[PDB]
Amino acid sequence: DCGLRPLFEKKSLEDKTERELLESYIIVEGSDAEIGMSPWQVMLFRKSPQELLCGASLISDRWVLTAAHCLLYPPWDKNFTENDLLVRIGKHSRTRYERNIEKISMLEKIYIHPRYNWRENLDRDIALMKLKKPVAFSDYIHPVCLPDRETAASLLQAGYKGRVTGWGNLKEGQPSVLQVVNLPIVERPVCKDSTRIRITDNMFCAGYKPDEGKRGDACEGDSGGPFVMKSPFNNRWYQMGIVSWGEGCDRDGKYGFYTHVFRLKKWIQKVIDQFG
Amino acid sequence: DFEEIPEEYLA
Ligand SMILES: O=C(Cn1c(Cl)cnc(NCC(F)(F)c2cccc[n+]2[O-])c1=O)NCc1cc(Cl)ccc1-n1cnnn1
């Protein structure tokens, strides 16, 4: 039942911008999300001080996916442990405690990819978090699907648009509610030629070119959030990427880089059936 | 500027 939103797909209602994604299958400069628009959106909340740590996504009733650099990044003296964080699911407003809607869960264990490269280019920027107890689904809490080889092959194409969501900065400016922006995947050569950072097959970039007029990008605090696409085949939402890195936010000639979820699914599966 | 969350989760 993953990837089918209670307030949209389940009722045969479409959100205001999913058509844009579909037409292409042939947060800075974003907008307020609709209620229940991204039921898999997870907020990584730091206990002390109480603040936004990163975004994340719900992939099952007990597992949450995020970016490794959200939990471990020595250059900025970041090395969070289970008890340092909380997971807030079903939220819309950034700072308000949404009584009777959101669910706050504690972490049981954190799993960071063994070959995550924080020293150089954030290669394999991915991590799993197992919750102490199952989260109850609702109109505002629902898991997104993980792509299989076929889904990745057909949707991960230059030009095809995905959707990024988060409570991160609005400019390189804190949002009142969850923000959303649809961005086109960019050809590998263009991604490579836009930066001096070494790009790997475990990442893909997205965003508009300067000549395309439109813009948008993820920013500080959006890391760990999902880059999703709605399959035109079975109408389910799939998380194809994880907000990973970028040089600044929404700069012309630059693009956002996302962890290639399918490429690391082997690891995800391994961890889930081994420890969970 | 974050609203105080229940103590049950902080404990
Ligand atoms: O900030 C981060 C993570 N992050 C980290 Cl941990 C280190 N250096 C970043 N950018 C500089 C860089 F040289 F490229 C780079 C890339 C990889 C490794 C080291 N450096 O040095 C970076 O983006 N993610 C948020 C983010 C995601 C996207 Cl998809 C787009 C923009 C941003 N933001 C980047 N800064 N704020 N937001």
Measured in Å, residue A265 CA sits from the centre of ligand 1 at 23
Please, what's the b/e burial string for A195-230 (b: 16 or more CB within 10 A of its CB; e: otherwise)? bebebeebbbbbbbeeeeeebbbbbebbbbbbbbbb
| Cβ-Cβ contacts under 8 Å, B5 against chain A | 45, 50, 86, 97, 104
CB distance A178 to A251 below 8 Å: no
Q: Do the Cβ atoms of A97 and B9 come within 8 Å?
A: no
Look at residues A44, A68, A38, A241 and name the one whose alpha carbon lies nearest to residue A144.
Answer: A38
CATH topology of domain A39-143+263-274: Thrombin, subunit H (2.40.10)
Q: Please report, for chain A, the start and end positions of each structural domain, with discontinuous segments joined by +.
A: 27-38+144-262, 39-143+263-274
CB pairs < 8 Å spanning A and B: 22
Method: X-ray
Q: Which residue has the tokens 């907020």?
A: A43
CATH class of A27-38+144-262: mainly beta
Q: Which of A97, A104, A174 is closest, CB to CB, to B3?
A: A97
Distance from CA of B1 to the nearest CA of A (A): 7
Please, what's the b/e burial string for A29-55 (b: 16 or more CB within 10 A of its CB; e: otherwise)? bbeebbebbbbbbbbbbebeeeebbbb
3-state secondary structure chain A: CCCCCCCCHHHCCCCCCHHHHHHHCCCECCEECCCCCCCCEEEEEECCCCEEEEEEEECCCCEEEECHHHCEEHHHCEECCHHHEEEEECCCECCCCCCCCCEEEEEEEEEECCCCECCCCCECCCEEEEECCCCCCCCCCCCCECCCHHHHHHHCCCCCEEEEEECCCCCCCCCCECEEEEEEECCHHHHHHCCCCCCCCCEEEECCCHHHCCCCECCCCCCCCEEEEECCCCCCEEEEEEEEECCCCCCCCCCEEEEECHHHHHHHHHHHHHHC
Can you read off the two tokens belonging to residue A8?
Answer: 């949209």
Is A227 close to ligand 1, i.e. is its CB under 6 Å away?
no
What resolution, expressed in A, was reported for this entry? Answer: 1.8
Residue type, A96: R
In Å, how far from its chain's centre is CA A91? 15
CB distance A219 to A28 below 8 Å: yes
Look at residues A210, A212, A192, A209 and name the one whose alpha carbon lies nearest to residue A200.
Answer: A192
Is A4 close to ligand 1, i.e. is its CB under 6 Å away?
no
State the number of CA atoms in the 13 A half-sphere of A118 facing the CB.
Answer: 18
Distance from CA of B9 to the nearest CA of A (A): 7
Q: d(Cα A57, Cα A222) in Å, to the nearest integer? A: 11
| Cβ-Cβ contacts under 8 Å, A86 against chain B | 5, 9
A125, A187, B11 from A202: Cα distances, Å: 9, 14, 38
Do the domains A39-143+263-274 and A27-38+144-262 match in fold? yes
C-alpha gyration radius of chain B:
7
- Of the candidates A123, A125, A217, A250, the residue annotated as catalytic is A125
Q: Do the Cβ atoms of A104 and B5 come within 8 Å?
A: yes
Is A69 a known active-site residue?
Answer: yes
To test the contact with chain A by mutation, choose from B1, B2, B10 the residue with the greatest count of A C-beta atoms within 10 A, namely B2
Angle at A239 between CA A236 and CA A245, to 5 degrees: 155
For ligand 1, atom 27: residue with the closest CA: A245
